Design a protein around this ligand. Structure first.
Ligand SMILES: NC(=O)c1ccc[n+]([C@@H]2O[C@H](COP(=O)([O-])OP(=O)(O)OC[C@H]3O[C@@H](n4cnc5c(N)ncnc54)[C@H](OP(=O)(O)O)[C@@H]3O)[C@@H](O)[C@H]2O)c1
Ligand SMILES: NC(=O)c1ccc[n+]([C@@H]2O[C@H](COP(=O)([O-])OP(=O)(O)OC[C@H]3O[C@@H](n4cnc5c(N)ncnc54)[C@H](OP(=O)(O)O)[C@@H]3O)[C@@H](O)[C@H]2O)c1
Lengths: 1102, 76
């Protein structure tokens, strides 16, 4: 509109052009040339950013920081430049609004430090850092022949096919990030990829002021994965971690191709060099040294894999929802079932024509099978309820009976499957078959049937194989309610009047699923720590092995320790440290020497001492250096010294030592109601200084006024400054014990006059690199930084003397001790909530229990598991997993490993045992059929023989005979059942039967199968044997004995690897969880098929 | 700063800013206490920072709109 422009040539709105990401730019008024941008990278501001998402959560791609760095070059360094050593730190998770701060600072001419950070509730989080360089030479790589390149790379890779592959590992690329059309490759020998990238149509409008659009640059990074050497080697989650050198030669608007080159292709990561070419082949941008990789740590990769692979069955309290003839059939005729009687009466009571069948063991099964098939063809029925009979506490009997039930349910299930018409719904009613409520002790016999009904439902889904695990107390009126409601639930249970329903889920927790113990407080190590800072509920009492001290160290028996404000920040994760590592809870202590390490003349055992250590002083025993402890004088207790130490030390150092607090001079004590505050008052009163104090609460301020201190102000504002200037007739103060921050720090410096002694104890502003204006220093001011924590490492003698001098002054009575409020170790979190909320006054002391009392404690991975002072037994050790585990255990440090297998050792097995015995650890081989009882005893006696107590068992012994329900013979059931169930019981008995050597074991593990859990068709007999063995472990745990079961997946020698399972096995044992299911889950065919068929795997579909 | 109606308190000017074709100035307001903020204008040239103006800002003050006058009566 030529008119609109001429009339608008007068009222113009004041606006300025900005970068889409970087946003508003400000150059700070300081040397060196320091720049600063503030901008939004939220999904509301930049919709297209929602299309890049890791694990279904929108995150900022690596490519975004690349653009930000490239963009920040020209304004800082007014020239053509590069971006060197660009690194991506934490993963930025995007919201509707995600403000981000970029900042570049000139270090040297033609060089500048770059950095993208994000600020949340005061806490800064660095997201990326690099170096900008302008001095670099204009070395534009020569244009390429797009025709020749594409001719040299004939093998085409589709973009959608590759982006689908990214979705499996967890990385999602939406419409915006689908720029990669297709990538052309050749072989692994050829290290290059010619990719056909292009910024999608919607984003072409939004090319705006981008050096390179991050959507486009990420599509180039995707192109690197199309290389065959990358696909073959690094078959894991590859995320960009950084870029060695980034330069833009021109506009990337017309980029149509991306030429990649593999520098290095390793299992850990992939390095590559990129070049963005236009249609002609001219280079527009180059990325040398693009580093991709498995996000963080090698050990953190294992921990993450283990979590995804684990599986557990969980029971949910459910209600029967919404809105034909029936047949009730039995499994024991000589046993009169009131459940069967009551069910038939309740179905007829509901108004359904019910018939009853009496199939029992030791009966003509071919004739009864024909009688059943006749009843089905005679009348069309809706469902068939199979009532399993319960005989009449002996497990031995229930293990033998459990086989007969499986053999009999196969006979019944086979005849229902072989139906001319539409098969009716099968309902199997078992008596306390499996564990649902934590209080339950499982009734076996029916334990094996849950694996069979799961396989029958998979082999023959027409008849929806449903299981109903009933208890004695429940009522038949509520049971038939389930049969007639027709809910699609396949695994169900009844405990009292409540209906439960199973559901498969991964649960790799480490809270209740971690070992527990009880430990003495006089003996045995126990320490207090936060498993994850921020949450005070995560404050745990952990165990530690208190070892011999030395050289030049001392073990102290702590009677008490303090709670400093520093220990609160540690609890919330807000504590700053020069080391970088977050310190341990408890800095100071007061105790009695336990042991003196070789060799120190200074300390003696039984000396009452107080000191410092780190390493957690909220524990019964602390090992501290001789440099950090001092004998307490007679005038003070362990608890008095534990409170005083740091508060008075910091003050002593700060006021009387650094600031040389003279008499009469005015002192400003910030937050004077606290520990350091009360200590400051004490020495200020002693020195004869005029006190000016501050405090947050009115109640807290009024306390200072009552303590006899005139001149009290608010610590949360900058009022105190002008108020003190008025209350001193413009003089101000002399000394300032600054615990406060920000403008209150600056205001405090501006306050003190001539004498000027600013003592900063507060670390926040130092670690934040706050540019402190030097102009107030024109009056001979003196700034003092104080970090006793650091001093304890750099000059421990000065800290020794500083503690020793305050313990002397306080014991002499030269200084009076402050308000001390004791807290038992248990209520430590409560003291933190109080201190952390500014509710407290004075000092808070943690009292350590000097008693013969016991306290419940948690061993994380201090668990023994594999040890040289203990023997081990492995059934099925001469082959399969057992031989790999035995070899791994011998290497892990095990004294005597008895290996068993009914067959003699093979030629390759004997060779493996020879090299293990050659490399120290002895391996005994005692053959036998574990199904026979004498074998279990012979094994146990052999493992103990070398003066070693049995510390663990492994039940890998197994037979696998697979057959379809139609051809599952009665003999084949006993073949698979015998080693798994009879061996497990004979092992259990051999352990109890054994003397005190066997009554000391740490674990009892049993290798189960994932086929029992899901229902792999054809297994059946093997599946049922495992479901009994899985329930047997929950029963063994219920009795108190240790017990474990690991339902394994598919091993190698997509499928579990050998060394992958070794870590999982060892890990599962470090934790107190009975059922563990290690199996490759990802997005497998058998899981996607199982999730859509039944609501048991509801959480897997999502 | 204070997303509301506000007063500017104790506005002081110090050194006389002489202007050139370019004279960059940095304004800077920080919250100190609630509904209150230290305001400050300054200029950095050759390494010497020069505070050209300062004040406090208040958003907690009450809108006591002075009464309107009679333009014509006033002129009489
Ligand atoms: N080596 C060292 O550098 C060193 C040694 C010791 C202590 N210090 C520093 O000195 C300070 C006091 O130590 P202390 O334990 O002896 O005294 P303290 O009074 O026990 O420490 C806590 C006080 O900090 C104030 N505070 C401000 N913001 C707070 C928040 N978000 N949460 C909780 N409290 C808050 C509260 O006082 P008001 O409400 O009265 O303002 C509270 O009483 C700490 O800030 C600590 O880092 C430094
Ligand atoms: O390959 P695999 O299958 O993974 O291994 C199974 C292992 O269990 C053993 N095993 C199977 N049935 C057993 C039984 N009744 N008693 C003892 N060990 C048994 C096997 O040896 P065997 O061939 O000796 O049964 C073999 O070492």
């Amino acid at each position: 509109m030529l008119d609109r422009e001429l009339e608008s040539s007068a009222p113009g709105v004041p606006s300025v052009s900005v970068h889409p990401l970087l946003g508003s730019h400000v150059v700070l008024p300081q040397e060196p040339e320091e720049h600063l941008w503030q901008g939004d990278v939220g999904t509301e501001a930049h919709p297209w950013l929602s299309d890049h998402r890791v694990h279904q959560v929108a995150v900022l791609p690596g490519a975004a920081y690349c653009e930000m760095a490239l963009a920040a070059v020209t304004p800082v360094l007014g020239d053509t430049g590069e971006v060197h050593d660009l690194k991506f730190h934490d993963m930025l998770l995007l919201d509707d609004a995600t403000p981000v701060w970029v900042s570049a600072a000139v270090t040297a001419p033609g060089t500048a430090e770059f950095g993208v950070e994000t600020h949340q509730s005061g806490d800064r989080t660095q997201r990326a850092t690099a170096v900008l360089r302008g001095d670099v030479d204009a070395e534009r790589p020569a244009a390429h022949s797009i025709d020749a390149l594409l001719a040299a790379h004939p093998n085409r890779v589709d973009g959608d096919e590759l982006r689908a592959g990214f979705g499996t590992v967890g990385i999602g690329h939406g419409a915006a990030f689908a720029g990669l059309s297709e990538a052309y490759v050749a072989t692994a020998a050829e290290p290059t990829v010619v990719a056909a990238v292009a910024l999608p149509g919607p984003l072409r409008s939004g090319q705006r002021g981008y050096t390179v659009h991050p959507a486009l640059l990420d599509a180039c990074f995707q192109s690197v994965i199309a290389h065959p050497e990358v696909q073959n080697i690094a078959s894991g989650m590859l995320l960009p971690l950084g870029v060695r050198r980034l330069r833009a030669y021109g506009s990337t608007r017309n980029v149509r191709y991306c030429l990649s080159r593999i520098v290095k292709a390793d299992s850990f990561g992939v390095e590559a060099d990129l070049e963005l070419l236009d249609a002609d082949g001219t280079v527009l941008l180059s990325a040398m040294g693009l580093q991709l990789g498995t996000g963080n740590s090698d050990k953190a990769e294992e921990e993450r894999l283990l979590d995804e692979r684990l599986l557990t069955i969980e029971w949910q309290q459910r209600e029967l929802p919404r809105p034909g003839s029936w047949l009730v059939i039995l499994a024991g005729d000589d046993d009169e079932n009131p459940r069967a009687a009551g069910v038939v009466s309740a179905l007829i009571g509901a108004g359904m024509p019910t018939t009853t069948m009496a199939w029992s063991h030791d009966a003509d099964h071919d004739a009864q099978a024909a009688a059943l098939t006749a009843r089905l063809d005679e009348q069309p029925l809706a469902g068939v309820a199979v009532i399993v009979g319960d005989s009449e506490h002996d497990v031995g009997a229930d293990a033998r009976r459990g086989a007969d039930h499986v053999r009999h349910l196969v006979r019944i299930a086979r005849t229902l499957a072989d139906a001319v018409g539409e098969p009716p719904r099968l309902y199997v009613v078992t008596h306390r078959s499996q564990h649902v409520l934590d209080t339950d002790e499982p009734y076996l016999e029916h334990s094996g049937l849950r694996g069979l009904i799961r396989v029958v439902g998979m082999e023959h889904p027409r008849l929806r194989a449903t299981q109903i695990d009933v208890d004695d107390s429940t009522a038949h009126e509520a049971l038939v309610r389930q049969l007639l409601s027709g809910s699609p639930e396949d695994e169900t249970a009844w405990r009292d009047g409540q209906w439960y329903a199973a559901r498969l889920c991964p649960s790799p927790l480490r809270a209740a699923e971690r070992r527990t113990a009880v430990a003495d407080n006089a003996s045995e190590g126990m320490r207090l720590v936060v498993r994850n800072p921020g949450d005070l509920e995560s404050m745990e009492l952990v165990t530690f092995e208190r070892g011999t001290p030395g050289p030049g160290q001392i073990e102290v028996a702590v009677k008490a320790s303090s709670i400093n404000f520093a220990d609160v920040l540690v609890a919330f994760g807000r504590c700053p440290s020069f080391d970088g590592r977050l310190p341990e809870l408890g800095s100071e202590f007061g105790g009695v020497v336990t042991a003196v390490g070789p060799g120190v003349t200074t300390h003696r055992v039984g000396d009452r001492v107080g000191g410092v250590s780190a390493n957690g002083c909220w524990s019964n025993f602390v090992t501290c250096e001789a440099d950090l402890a001092t004998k307490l004088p007679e005038g003070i207790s362990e608890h008095e010294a534990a409170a005083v130490g740091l508060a008075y030390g910091t003050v002593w150092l700060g006021l009387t030592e650094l600031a040389r607090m003279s008499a009469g001079d005015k002192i400003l004590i910030h937050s004077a109601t606290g520990g350091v505050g009360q200590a400051a008052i004490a020495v200020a009163r002693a020195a004869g200084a005029e006190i000016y104090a501050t405090a947050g609460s009115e109640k807290r301020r009024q306390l200072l006024r009552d303590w006899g201190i005139e001149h009290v102000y608010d610590s949360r504002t900058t009022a105190f400054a002008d108020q003190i200037r008025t209350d001193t007739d413009g003089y101000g103060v002399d000394i300032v014990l600054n615990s406060v921050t920000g403008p209150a720090q600056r205001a405090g410096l501006e306050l003190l006059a001539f004498g000027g002694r600013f003592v900063e104890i507060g670390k926040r502003d130092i670690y934040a690199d706050t540019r402190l204006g030097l102009f107030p220093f024109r009056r001979n001011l003196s700034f003092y930084a104080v970090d006793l924590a650091l001093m304890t490492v750099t000059h421990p003698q000065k800290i020794r003397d500083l503690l020793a001098t305050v313990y002397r002054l306080i014991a002499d009575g030269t200084l009076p001790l402050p308000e001390i409020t004791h807290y038992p170790l248990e209520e430590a979190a409560t003291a933190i909530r109080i201190m952390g909320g500014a509710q407290h006054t004075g000092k808070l002391v943690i009292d350590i229990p000097d008693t013969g009392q016991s306290q419940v404690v948690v061993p994380p991975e201090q668990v023994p598991v594999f040890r040289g002072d203990g023997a081990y037994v492995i059934t099925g050790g001469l082959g399969g997993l057992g031989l790999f585990l035995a070899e791994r255990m011998a290497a892990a440090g095990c004294g005597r490993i008895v290996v068993n297998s009914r067959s003699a050792p093979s030629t390759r097995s004997s060779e493996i045992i020879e090299l293990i015995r050659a490399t120290g650890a002895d391996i005994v081989v005692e053959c036998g059929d574990i199904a026979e009882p004498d074998t279990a005893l012979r094994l146990v006696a052999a493992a103990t023989q070398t003066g070693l107590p049995l510390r663990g068992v492994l039940h890998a012994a197994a037979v696998v005979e697979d057959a379809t329900l139609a051809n599952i013979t009665d003999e084949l059931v006993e073949h698979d059942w015998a080693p798994k169930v009879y061996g497990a019981w004979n092992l259990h008995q051999a352990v109890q039967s054994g003397g005190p050597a066997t009554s000391e074991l740490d674990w009892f593990c049993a290798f189960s199968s994932a086929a029992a859990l899901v229902g792999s068709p054809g297994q059946g007999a093997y599946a049922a044997a495992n479901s009994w063995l899985d329930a047997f472990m929950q029963w063994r745990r219920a009795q108190g004995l240790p017990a474990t079961s690991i339902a394994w997946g598919a091993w190698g020698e997509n499928a579990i690897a050998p060394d992958e399972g070794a870590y999982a096995f060892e890990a599962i044992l470090r934790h107190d969880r009975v059922y563990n299911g290690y199996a490759p889950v990802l997005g497998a065919s058998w899981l996607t098929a199982f999730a859509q068929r039944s609501p048991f795997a509801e959480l897997f579909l999502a």
